[PDB]
Amino acid sequence: EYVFESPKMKEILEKIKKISCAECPVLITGESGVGKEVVARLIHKLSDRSKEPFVALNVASIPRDIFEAELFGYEKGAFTGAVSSKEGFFELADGGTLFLDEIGELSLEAQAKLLRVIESGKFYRLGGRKEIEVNVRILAATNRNIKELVKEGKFREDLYYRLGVIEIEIPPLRERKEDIIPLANHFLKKFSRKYAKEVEGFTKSAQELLLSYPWYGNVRELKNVIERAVLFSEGKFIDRGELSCLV
Amino acid sequence: EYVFESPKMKEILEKIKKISCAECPVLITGESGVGKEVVARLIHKLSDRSKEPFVALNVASIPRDIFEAELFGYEKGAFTGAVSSKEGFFELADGGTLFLDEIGELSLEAQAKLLRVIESGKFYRLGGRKEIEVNVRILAATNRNIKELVKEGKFREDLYYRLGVIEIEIPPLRERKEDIIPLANHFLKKFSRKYAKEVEGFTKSAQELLLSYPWYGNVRELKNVIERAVLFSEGKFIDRGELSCLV
Amino acid sequence: EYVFESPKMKEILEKIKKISCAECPVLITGESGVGKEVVARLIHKLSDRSKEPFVALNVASIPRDIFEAELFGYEKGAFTGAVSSKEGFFELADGGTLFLDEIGELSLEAQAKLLRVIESGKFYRLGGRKEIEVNVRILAATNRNIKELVKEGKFREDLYYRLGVIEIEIPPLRERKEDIIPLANHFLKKFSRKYAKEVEGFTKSAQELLLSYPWYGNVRELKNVIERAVLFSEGKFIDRGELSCLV
Amino acid sequence: EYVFESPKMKEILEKIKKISCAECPVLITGESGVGKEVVARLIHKLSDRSKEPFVALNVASIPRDIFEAELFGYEKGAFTGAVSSKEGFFELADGGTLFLDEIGELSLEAQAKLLRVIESGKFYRLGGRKEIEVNVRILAATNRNIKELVKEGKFREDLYYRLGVIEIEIPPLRERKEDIIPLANHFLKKFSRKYAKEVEGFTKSAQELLLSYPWYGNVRELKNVIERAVLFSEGKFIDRGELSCLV
Amino acid sequence: LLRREKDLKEEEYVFESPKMKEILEKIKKISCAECPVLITGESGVGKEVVARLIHKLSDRSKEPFVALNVASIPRDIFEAELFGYEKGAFTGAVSSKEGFFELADGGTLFLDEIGELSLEAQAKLLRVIESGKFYRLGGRKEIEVNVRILAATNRNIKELVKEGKFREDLYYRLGVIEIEIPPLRERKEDIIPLANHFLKKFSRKYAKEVEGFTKSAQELLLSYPWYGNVRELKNVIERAVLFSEGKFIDRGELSCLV
Amino acid sequence: EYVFESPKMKEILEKIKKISCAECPVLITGESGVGKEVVARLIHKLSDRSKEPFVALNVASIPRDIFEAELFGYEKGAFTGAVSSKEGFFELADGGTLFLDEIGELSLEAQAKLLRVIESGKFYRLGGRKEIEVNVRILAATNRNIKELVKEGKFREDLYYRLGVIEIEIPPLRERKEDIIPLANHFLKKFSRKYAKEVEGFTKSAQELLLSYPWYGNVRELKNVIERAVLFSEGKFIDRGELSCLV
Ligand SMILES: Nc1ncnc2c1ncn2[C@@H]1O[C@H](COP(=O)(O)OP(=O)(O)O)[C@@H](O)[C@H]1O
Ligand SMILES: [Mg+2]
Numbered sequence A, B, C, D, F: 001e002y003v004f005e006s007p008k009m010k011e012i013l014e015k016i017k018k019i020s021c022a023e024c025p026v027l028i029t030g031e032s033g034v035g036k037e038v039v040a041r042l043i044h045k046l047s048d049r050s051k052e053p054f055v056a057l058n059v060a061s062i063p064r065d066i067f068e069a070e071l072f073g074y075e076k077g078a079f080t081g082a083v084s085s086k087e088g089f090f091e092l093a094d095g096g097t098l099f100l101d102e103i104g105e106l107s108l109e110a111q112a113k114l115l116r117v118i119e120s121g122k123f124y125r126l127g128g129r130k131e132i133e134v135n136v137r138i139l140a141a142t143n144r145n146i147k148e149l150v151k152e153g154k155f156r157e158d159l160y161y162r163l164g165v166i167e168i169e170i171p172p173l174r175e176r177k178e179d180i181i182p183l184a185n186h187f188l189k190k191f192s193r194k195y196a197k198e199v200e201g202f203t204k205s206a207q208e209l210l211l212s213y214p215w216y217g218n219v220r221e222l223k224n225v226i227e228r229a230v231l232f233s234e235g236k237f238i239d240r241g242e243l244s245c246l247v
Numbered sequence E: 001l002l003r004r005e006k007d008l009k010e011e012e013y014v015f016e017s018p019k020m021k022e023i024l025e026k027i028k029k030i031s032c033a034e035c036p037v038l039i040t041g042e043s044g045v046g047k048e049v050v051a052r053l054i055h056k057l058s059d060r061s062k063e064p065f066v067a068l069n070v071a072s073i074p075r076d077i078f079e080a081e082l083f084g085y086e087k088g089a090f091t092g093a094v095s096s097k098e099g100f101f102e103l104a105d106g107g108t109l110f111l112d113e114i115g116e117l118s119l120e121a122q123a124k125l126l127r128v129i130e131s132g133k134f135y136r137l138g139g140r141k142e143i144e145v146n147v148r149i150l151a152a153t154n155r156n157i158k159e160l161v162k163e164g165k166f167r168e169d170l171y172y173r174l175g176v177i178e179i180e181i182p183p184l185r186e187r188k189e190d191i192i193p194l195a196n197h198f199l200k201k202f203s204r205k206y207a208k209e210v211e212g213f214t215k216s217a218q219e220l221l222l223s224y225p226w227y228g229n230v231r232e233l234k235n236v237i238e239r240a241v242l243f244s245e246g247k248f249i250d251r252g253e254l255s256c257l258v
């Protein structure tokens, strides 16, 4: 029910469908709020692994101190914790796909811990003495410029080229004008339902404006703008005037 | 109890009643001491959740070390934490409202931690392997210009669009002259009673001064000036002369 | 046992007596050694709260790391913190008065933490989920000019309006000529007693020069100068010569 | 075993004996190696506390992170302060004398922490709820020009007036010619004893040179020069030639 | 065979120079001395060797010799690893721990690359160097230890003092005895004996047939103003032996090295 | 299985064969991605220690805070953190060979710490009082010309003399014409195998681009472009079109 229109955005859809079967690293890039999360969620859904669990993690929100332990896991006892052994996030995602959003904001110290893990697909639980092997597809996302961080010495060069084997860029909305209106309508359906309103669609006078506003917040800002409009709506349609106070 | 007399403020008064039913995040701006907290607490009382918990947080007062742990919560066995597991502030506010005050003073590193939590209402407990989802309405406030801070790279662009579903600016007092006297009189009533004094109201010449002093501290300054005035009053009324030493 | 002889100090002394019933924060300013500390104790003794605890604190002296914990207090578990629950200085002063000297030396980042505590008198213990409310009258003092610093952006504007309910400035010593001699005798009386000397009073020639001194160190400097002078005293009276080497 | 043959140092010696009874802080200044430590160590021996504790401290050797803790002391709790409670240096010096060497090397921010402690002799232990009071004589030393530092804003004026009750200036060695030879013989005595040598005294020509030698390092340099000579000595006396080589 | 290993006779060492011969004698005089020593010179001149030697000829030769790169100590634990620390006062460890100073008690302490220290860091050592006294971190008992200090730097230290880049008061604590090591280019006599010594060592390890140098080669070595000094030589000789074929080395083999 | 064709690449292999017995540090120079690690990795395989461990490390990438700890290792405690004892990379490489990558990108300050370690192979564990001694062969790499860099004061002169015994450069690619083609095919074999593809070899049209030289990223770019090309391959042979699409 989602929207893929325009020559630019439709082209990406083909790329994704072909790599659905692949076991190899993925690097997703673009501004935040362009729909990168949907794509990340989509690759898993379209893959040979569609029925398995999808584990969402906000990286960098993990403290550096428990990062390795909280991720890879630990056994019973073994450096003053609990009594019983506890699974790590990788083993829970074993056979599945793990999505790390905003990887580019990760600390230099933490990257090194997962670094050796990337190539071997093997690791040691903290305090565990038996090497474990798991099968996990890695997905990554960031709203920032990764190319820059490497040049600034803020990002390891070797990690970029390992994850950046395949790189998929999402362009902003201002470079996809054809996609604007169909999306706006999709949100109307959702918001009209939520707040139980009588709204149907937008007047043409309103529609012309969206194209001239170069949308710095992309999809994420739009979704918010519509939600505002539906709430203050009176009739079933929204005029340019109701947007004017919004802009 | 609460005072709104003004063109500017009455417009806002209407705005709140419509989102009383709304489930989405709110971002309040204005100088500090214009009543941002009153607005935040009021939305809750006027909403359908008015009977549920309301959690007030300074968020600048939170220590960096426990920031992650004290917020989301943890399961027993996170690097020798306690014995027992403890819920987080998000879980405590479930069904209720969570207010993050003076958010604009937060460091970029910390802002990012909150990213996945706001929109999805989902997160992971520390040491927990089970994804938790809770229902909490989020309000935020700051006394600085956040739109400018983003442009200066001092505040995350992606976080702004998550909280900024609704944006409400509070105008200063000098742009609300009609609010001055009602506010001034209301504060006097409580203080005269509290400190058991004989004071009732203001002389005409005194009232004229309040209108001419362009109030840089806004409403918060007013309350104090009356409190200063009430304590030193002799007769039942306050003249312009008694204010002269205060201004 | 305290000395107030002067037009300047007697006027202020009256103000203190009038606010004895008031429950609100006070801001003391002045050069170092002018008695800013004395007033803070005096307000307490003359107020209705005079019989309850008076807590003296160098706020600048609080290390940043435990700054939050030592102030608000904490529950048992805090990253292997203690065993037992412990109250903070705000809770310790409940029903009493809390005196923060050198408020002006705090970093902008740290000041932000104190905001909700000052006005609401409310906070959350560390690891505690129940909002606590305390009753504390706040007294503050600083050797800096706050009105200037705010304009220089070196001090939070919003915090000033929270603490600044009552503002007391106080003049240096050179602008109080009447206090010099009465004070000098008290210290001489004190030190002659302490150090068992034969000294009684001052020669006429000595006294005239002393009054014409700029006194950058104010009363504290006097106390030191008398202590220095008494030790080297020979006769029962002190001449201009023993003081002359200091000026 | 200490040497004072100079007119200036003899006057100071008298000055010291008169102030032996005082309980108040002393500030010693001068070039390094002029004997600032012997005087400080001596005053204790001549005071009423000569049998009481003498605490020697390099305030510069205290690391920034525990500066607060190592000084005031701490209770089991607080930091993750492990298990045992520990006294602070101030509690250690109660009834005794506290010697702070190289006070002049403190960072302006750090100076402020000890401020209330110096004058009041009062503080709170870390995690402690009972105010502790001690009676401590404070001694301080610096190799820097302190009068200058205040004027440049590099040293707080407020601390100076707390510490600066008694100020003792030690002149360099080049301004005490009378002290040179008596000192030299004493140093000759010790090293001749330690290294079991045959040396007795100086040639007439050599002694003259020492007097014309602008000692920049003062006594500390002399001691070293003597130590070199005793080691390399052959006969019972040292000629100008043995010194000519140095340097 | 590899790098003796039972070291009967010997690692030995070469001193044939007038300057170095004079310095060797000076050392013999301080064998009884308990006082700090300051060694200066270009890099690779044997400053470490002298330091190890002063220890060997002293009365403390049988007691501990603590070798330390001070520059390598982290700023954060610098105070702690040095003076030592008690059970608390950090979030450090559990148990109390001795410092390197307390470890060298009765012995000799060698501080290498002292000249690279930051002014903030130098000030901390003051009471410890001259008085030999300090307080352990979190400790309330004043500790007193007996330690002879040796120091080294590859820079000009008097210069640093005059430039305000090195604390003056500290200089007079360490600088009781000061030893300036001249470079090799000012010791011409040491050149040939050294090269021969290195050649023999490497010939054994890497089993080659080389014995000595041609007359033409020796001339070049003398005209090479050795900016890396002996350390450069040791490397240069080691380089030649591996690539050596016959028993002698000509000037041609050196040209690619210089 | 490594590819050496060009005369430059073939001659160097012979040089190594002679020094296989040598135990001394090595200095490798050339552009990034020229095979410095492979040359280095081969040397180990050819050495007397070839059967012992080989430790690869990027030095410039280590964070300053843990730089010392991860390198020398540490005993339990002696740090704020670190429950567990840790071997260092030096001790981990004991009896083996240690490869330091991108030394030329290392901070000047960090270089000074390594001095005694390189030549003497001795150090003290962090918090350990027992001296550690190891037998380790040194390998070094840089993307810059070091002899020049020292003269610019960007690299310590004394450290160079430790690593710079033998200096061997490598041409990037452009002076090796013969190595280009054999390499590309070698990867096709692995990548066709790894991802189970139908690919066999390259068409003549593909090769024409390969002969169009300008590889600014040298060999490192090649491996990635081929890895990229194989995934996007359609037929059993690859035309210029999938390669043309990148650069
Ligand atoms: N047969 C080969 N195929 C691909 N790459 C090779 C081959 N032989 C050597 N290399 C190159 O060896 C290099 C090893 O990395 P290196 O260039 O030493 O690191 P840096 O780029 O940091 O100098 C790789 O970049 C790789 O391209
Ligand atoms: Mg995202």
Ligand SMILES: [Mg+2]
Pocket (backbone or CB within 6 Å): B036, B037, B101, B102, B141
């Ligand atoms: Mg607020």
Ligand SMILES: [Mg+2]
Pocket (backbone or CB within 6 Å): C036, C037, C101, C102, C141
């Ligand atoms: Mg004060």
Ligand SMILES: [Mg+2]
Pocket (backbone or CB within 6 Å): D036, D037, D101, D102, D141
């Ligand atoms: Mg001193």
Ligand SMILES: [Mg+2]
Pocket (backbone or CB within 6 Å): E044, E047, E048, E112, E152
């Ligand atoms: Mg050296």
Ligand SMILES: [Mg+2]
Pocket (backbone or CB within 6 Å): F036, F037, F101, F102, F141
């Ligand atoms: Mg490399």
